[PDB]
Symmetry: C2
Subunit: 103 residues, 2 copies
């Protein structure tokens, strides 16, 4: 169902606000980007891509800005995951890798 | 009919070979081209991509062509248009900046 096909960037500054173009299989502009890192003995950090319905290009693309990472003071890169997700039923795509690098 | 809606980069090195994501209205993967051009005589360069880089008829991921002169000292502004191979129809242009190496 949900699939990320490709992204123009797979790395970003921990400060977020960087624009990325994502090409996906069919989505609905008002019912659709979850950055997440599975944390060590249970928890899960998440941040969401920033964009509006008009940024969803013809159901097959999304232009958005990255969320800020959980810790903007890291000195070494942090490898996290990115996935599509639907608001209506919280179903998701298989995750893609994303690399947060220090400021 | 043809329309460039947006591109993730509107500038690049004269050397070419830089990847760009272009979002467009409906195209046919086997009947589409991306033409960079400059009136002089007319210089043209074509986005480098395969039919499989045309994403669901609504986007094209490609690599920029090398500009005509790699030794420019100041940026050269050109146009980019989508163009159908069959009937040569084109979109409205967008500006694109080639900067010095």
């Amino acid at each position: 169902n949900l699939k990320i096909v490709r992204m123009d960037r797979t790395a970003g500054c921990v400060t977020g606000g960087e624009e990325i173009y994502l090409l996906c299989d069919k989505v609905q502009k008002d019912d659709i980007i979850r950055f997440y890192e599975e944390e060590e003995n249970g928890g899960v950090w998440e941040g969401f891509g920033d964009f509006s319905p008009t940024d969803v290009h013809r159901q097959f693309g999304i232009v958005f800005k990255t969320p800020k990472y959980k810790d903007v003071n890291i000195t070494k890169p942090a490898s996290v995951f990115v996935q599509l997700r639907r608001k209506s039923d919280l179903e998701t795509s298989e995750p893609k890798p994303f690399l947060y690098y220090p400021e």
